[PDB]
Design a protein around this ligand. Structure first.
Ligand SMILES: Nc1ncnc2c1ncn2[C@@H]1O[C@H](COP(=O)(O)OP(=O)(O)OP(=O)(O)O)[C@@H](O)[C@H]1O
Ligand SMILES: Nc1ncnc2c1ncn2[C@@H]1O[C@H](CSCC[C@H](N)C(=O)O)[C@@H](O)[C@H]1O
Ligand SMILES: [Mg+2]
Lengths: 211, 171, 434
């Protein structure tokens, strides 16, 4: 029984030590979409002018796994709530502990199975982040109903995912955007806007808004 | 004209190269830059008779004068000036002119390794005996005489022979 | 006191170094004159200089023999100057290396030394390692004692003596039988592609960073088995002084989960500790194949461990990962992402000209008869990769050895009197099945 850690270097120099498990679910390892999305938040286009866009703003990460995206936003001043299954809570609590010194905002690990009724989220967050969440039955309808119940009209949803061309993966991606169009308005961010080094022609960052 | 001269190392007149510092062999960023150009130019190498004919003609125009040196087995050097259009047979006649026995069966070769110049009709340009070449001499029945005694009396130093070729190639 | 950059030699002779014509005019050198070469740490050697059109003004071409004596690699800086003046040697003493004469006994002078120095006037300096082909092998010799010392020319009146027992080679003295660029044929274009990518980032990563070119972290080599992918990696690792670490795909995947992950960590730890280094992942399709991703608890995530170890490689690590696969389309897309495996080099099946180069390489030590037509063997070997042609030459040479006599120590003059014929190559071809 052993483990390996991924070092996610920020633009300012500080590194995020993320613990990963060699045996277990898909959320036990840092995926390439989480690396693309984490580095996208550091881009000067996203940071904008003056204080960072995430600074002092609420953000909810759906399907955090290790918590690479949620922890990156927490170091940029945001008020993060990283969510996942009950089995991924010990990893979320561990990664918060390993990088809490770099957190300028706040970060809490909550349980959130897609499709279930919302209990501890009365106010809609300013941001909803997703890293590689489209891949099976739960990504299709239960995930969309969670997005609809949680998000408000001013809530910005950022969905980063890798395009997979084997088995059920391409079918689930097509059905996800077919059902997403019924309630939300998605817009693909050009690859040129992504991080110069950590970007990919097969990894898409999409902006989703309610109504 | 050939302008014949004979030189021997036991005539250098005056006297160990100096050791170089370790900074001399330390590569610079421009040295690394030049190495990258060699690697890129070697990859670039990936033509009909007419192009090779022009390549040869343009090369012959660059060096219209040639300086040859015949290294005898007794460490003596017979130096003569030739033209690229002249043949290996003309070099043999030049050597025979300054031989003690003008009927000796000798052979001229380039090393390393031993590469005999059998084709006497082959020009110096084809035999790569240009612009300055060092050709060795061998004999079927080696005799200490080799050069004629008259030429050995007016023998100059090897350093003076280097002055004679530099002056000849400059003018 | 002129600085030149070391490059591969075109002339295969040991005593020959090539220089550009304008540089020979600049140095006032004669074609065939003796030059004195020196490099780092007081190392010295005397050679014969020849002109070359391919040679650039600031470069010098020398073969592995001169490079090993000067302790220099390709791209190094050396000092050249005319040496006045080398005297003809009175008597020299030469002794072979222990590993180079394993299984050979007898007159090594008649077989190797006599023809090598025969009327060649070769300039040898004390403590020089030189290579002599013959007797179906390449024998290295070391001039233990010279008279006069240290430099002398092996003239026809020089006494050559090879008495004594074979000598032991030092750790600094690397083998001339080791894998180099001169051992690869058929893919000279692919070797030039790779040399441009890895030679400089490995040897001078700080000076290469100032150039502006982004160095590669990983290089993909694809082609059928036995085509020379591993041979190319070993040669680059030796020619640049990089530490070589070989990883087998199905070998690692066969090991139980947990041990296979820890073995990957140890492979990258050894490369990082022994910088610069080249990690060679043979059969990469076994470690990182592309398959559908689903919500299930897997016993081992070996591809995530690979990418985590590759992304953590810094510029101060000096490690380049080269991987080999027969099916490049079956590789996981994450391997070609974020500049991990950035470049792709195709080492494919060689053509008629490429096959002749491999045959010339695998018959450089064996004595061939006049009727032997290597061009004909290359013409009728379609579908043969480098491994097939090397085994063909081994089986053709073994056929000639079997016809004479009937392994143990054989006489040197017996092996030298043996010549491989076309009937031996035709027999090897009738049995060769790629
Ligand atoms: N281009 C080549 N030139 C000379 N020899 C070659 C060449 N390619 C292969 N060989 C010979 O093949 C043998 C080793 O082949 P090698 O391991 O390099 O191939 P490979 O493509 O890596 O396949 P694999 O490792 O799966 O067997 C040696 O005998 C080597 O001399
Ligand atoms: N029904 C469901 N409810 C909540 N989380 C779920 C879920 N189905 C899958 N997940 C979680 O969604 C994630 C998919 S993998 C994404 C891991 C993470 N964002 C990273 O890329 O680093 C896993 O953490 C998995 O546990
Ligand atoms: Mg092999």
């Amino acid at each position: 029984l052993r483990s390996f850690v991924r070092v996610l270097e920020k633009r300012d120099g500080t590194v995020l030590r993320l613990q990963q498990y060699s045996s277990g679910g898909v959320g036990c390892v840092v995926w390439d979409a989480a690396i693309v999305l984490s580095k996208y938040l550091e881009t000067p286009e996203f940071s904008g002018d003056g204080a960072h866009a995430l600074s002092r703003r609420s953000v909810l990460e759906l399907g955090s796994g290790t918590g690479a995206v949620g922890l990156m936003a927490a170091t940029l001043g945001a008020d993060v709530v990283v969510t996942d299954l009950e089995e991924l809570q010990d990893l979320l609590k561990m990664n918060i502990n390993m990088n809490k010194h770099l957190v300028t905002g706040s970060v809490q690990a909550k349980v959130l199975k897609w499709g279930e009724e919302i209990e501890g989220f009365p106010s809609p967050p300013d941001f909803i982040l997703m890293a590689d969440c489209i891949y099976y039955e739960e990504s299709l309808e239960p995930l969309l109903k969670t997005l609809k119940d949680i998000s408000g009209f001013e809530t910005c949803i950022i969905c980063c995912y890798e395009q997979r061309t084997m088995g059920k993966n391409p079918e689930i991606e097509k059905k996800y955007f077919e059902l997403l169009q019924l309630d939300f308005d998605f817009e693909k961010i050009p690859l040129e806007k992504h991080d110069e080094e950590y970007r990919s022609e097969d990894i898409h960052i999409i902006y989703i808004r309610k109504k | 004209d050939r302008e014949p001269v004979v030189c021997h190392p036991d005539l250098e007149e005056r006297l160990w190269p100096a050791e170089l510092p370790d900074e001399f062999f330390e590569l610079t960023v421009d040295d690394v830059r030049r190495r990258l150009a060699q690697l890129k130019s070697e990859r670039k190498r990936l033509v009909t008779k007419a192009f090779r004919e022009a390549q040869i003609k343009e090369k012959l125009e660059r060096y219209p004068k040639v300086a040859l040196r015949v290294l005898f087995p007794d460490r003596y050097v017979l130096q003569g000036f030739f033209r690229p259009s002249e043949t290996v047979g003309d070099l043999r006649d030049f050597v025979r002119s300054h031989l003690g026995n003008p009927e000796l069966s000798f052979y001229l070769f380039i090393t390393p390794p031993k590469t005999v110049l059998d084709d006497h009709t082959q020009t110096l340009f084809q035999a790569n005996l240009f612009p300055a070449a060092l050709v060795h001499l061998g004999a079927e029945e080696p005799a200490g005489v080799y050069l004629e005694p008259g030429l050995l009396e007016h023998a100059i130093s090897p350093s003076a022979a280097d002055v004679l070729v530099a002056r000849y190639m400059s003018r | 006191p002129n600085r030149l950059i070391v490059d591969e030699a075109i002339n295969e002779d040991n005593s020959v170094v090539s220089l550009s014509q304008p540089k020979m005019d600049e140095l006032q050198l004669f074609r065939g004159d003796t030059v004195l070469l020196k490099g780092k740490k007081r190392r010295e050697a005397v050679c014969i200089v020849l002109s070359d059109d391919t040679c650039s003004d600031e470069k010098i071409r020398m073969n592995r023999v001169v490079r090993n004596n000067l302790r220099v690699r390709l791209g190094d800086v050396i000092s050249i100057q005319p040496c006045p003046d080398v005297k003809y040697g009175k008597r020299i003493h030469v002794l072979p290396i222990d590993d180079t004469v394993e299984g050979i006994t007898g007159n090594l002078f008649e077989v190797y030394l006599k023809p090598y120095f025969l009327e060649a006037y070769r300039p040898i300096r004390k403590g020089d390692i030189f290579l002599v082909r013959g007797g179906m092998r390449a024998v290295e010799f070391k001039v233990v004692e010279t008279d006069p010392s240290p430099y002398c020319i092996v003239a026809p009146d020089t006494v050559i003596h090879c008495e004594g027992e074979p000598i032991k080679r030092e750790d600094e003295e690397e083998s001339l039988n080791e894998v180099g660029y001169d051992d690869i044929g058929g893919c000279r274009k692919q070797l030039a592609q790779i040399k441009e990518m890895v030679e400089l980032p490995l040897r001078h990563p700080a000076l290469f960073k100032a150039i502006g070119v982004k160095p590669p972290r990983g290089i993909l080599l694809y082609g059928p088995p036995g085509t020379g992918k591993t041979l190319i990696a070993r040669a680059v690792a030796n020619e640049t002084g990089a530490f070589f670490f070989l990883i087998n795909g199905p070998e690692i995947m066969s090991k139980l989960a947990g041990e296979s992950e820890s073995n990957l960590r140890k492979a990258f730890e050894e490369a990082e500790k022994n910088a610069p280094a080249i990690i060679f992942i043979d059969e990469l399709d076994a470690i990182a194949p592309k398959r559908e991703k689903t919500h299930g608890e897997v016993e081992r995530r070996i591809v995530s461990q690979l990418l985590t170890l590759m992304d953590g490689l810094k510029q101060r690590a000096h490690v380049i990962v080269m991987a080999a696969t027969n099916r490049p389309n079956s590789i996981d897309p994450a391997l070609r992402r974020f500049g991990r495996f950035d470049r792709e080099v195709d080492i494919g099946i060689p053509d008629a000209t490429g096959r002749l180069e491999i045959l010339q390489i695998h018959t450089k030590n064996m004595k061939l008869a006049d009727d032997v037509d290597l061009e004909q063997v290359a013409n009728e070997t379609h579908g043969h990769v480098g491994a097939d042609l090397a085994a063909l030459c081994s089986e053709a040479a073994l056929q000639a050895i079997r016809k004479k006599m009937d392994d143990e120590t054989i006489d040197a003059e017996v092996m030298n009197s043996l010549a491989v014929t076309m009937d031996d190559f035709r027999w090897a071809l009738s049995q060769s099945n790629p």
